[PDB]
Design a protein around this ligand. Structure first.
Ligand SMILES: *[C@@H]1O[C@H](CO)[C@@H](O[C@@H]2O[C@H](CO)[C@@H](O[C@@H]3O[C@H](CO[C@H]4O[C@H](CO[C@H]5O[C@H](CO)[C@@H](O)[C@H](O)[C@@H]5O)[C@@H](O)[C@H](O[C@H]5O[C@H](CO)[C@@H](O)[C@H](O)[C@@H]5O)[C@@H]4O)[C@@H](O)[C@H](O[C@H]4O[C@H](CO)[C@@H](O)[C@H](O)[C@@H]4O)[C@@H]3O)[C@H](O)[C@H]2NC(C)=O)[C@H](O)[C@H]1NC(C)=O
Lengths: 49, 48, 73
């Protein structure tokens, strides 16, 4: 429950983030790299749990 | 592209000729100054 | 050596600064190649200048070997 609800909150904040960060495709933004890192970290924590 | 006013028997289009004598039947690009778009790349641009 | 240079207006022949000898001419197209032809750059360098993928660079050590395309050596 904890892990999946954290994942849900992170998905909602990603829905927030897409309003703020640029949609450029030339290169991965540093903030975008950090967001992907956080998402993969959550997913790995869920798998390990 | 077309002439808004004149028909084919009044105005007739042809492609420009490069300084080397070759017809430029394509969209020209300043390869030394053009910058690709952040979302789309251009592969071909023929003209007819 | 003496090479033509585009640094001055109009193009003029200037002796290379000490340490450089090779004359070069670099030409590449831009948006105005429709009527004006390729850009022209003239100068002197200690070694054959680097070339971009779309830029043609010529290097020669002879005297007056880098004139403008519309002028004779
Ligand atoms: C952000 O991006 C922008 C662009 O997007 C970028 O801007 C560039 O900035 C750099 C430096 O930061 C600029 O480089 C300098 O350019 C100077 C201008 O040189 C041009 O104009 C000269 C005209 O003045 C002489 O010539 C005329 C007739 O020619 C005469 O009447 C005048 O009296 C006067 O004598 C001209 O000489 C020069 O020509 C050179 O280059 C051309 C190639 O274009 C070549 O054909 C020539 O043979 C000749 O080499 C050119 O047209 C320039 O003076 C300056 O010189 C420094 O370096 C040279 C060594 O190369 C030293 O000898 C000299 O003492 C100086 O230290 C230097 O080259 C560049 O031009 C800008 N370009 C643009 C497009 O804006 C910013 O930098 C970027 N920001 C950051 C933070 O990086």
């Amino acid at each position: 429950t904890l892990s999946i609800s954290v994942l849900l909150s992170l998905t909602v904040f990603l829905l927030v983030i897409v309003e703020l960060i640029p949609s450029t495709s030339s290169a991965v933004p540093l903030i975008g790299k950090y967001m992907l890192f956080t998402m993969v970290f959550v997913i790995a924590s869920i798998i390990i749990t | 592209f077309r002439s808004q006013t004149y028909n084919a028997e009044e105005v007739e289009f042809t492609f420009a000729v490069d300084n080397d004598g070759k017809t430029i039947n394509k969209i020209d690009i300043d390869t030394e100054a053009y910058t690709e778009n952040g979302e789309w790349a251009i592969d071909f641009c023929p003209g007819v | 050596i003496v090479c033509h240079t585009t640094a001055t207006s109009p193009i003029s022949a200037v002796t290379c600064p000490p340490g450089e000898n090779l004359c070069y001419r670099k030409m590449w197209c831009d948006a105005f190649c429709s009527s004006r032809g390729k850009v022209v750059e003239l100068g002197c360098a200690a070694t054959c200048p680097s070339k971009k993928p779309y830029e043609e660079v010529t290097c020669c050590s002879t005297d007056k070997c880098n004139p403008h395309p519309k002028q004779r050596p």
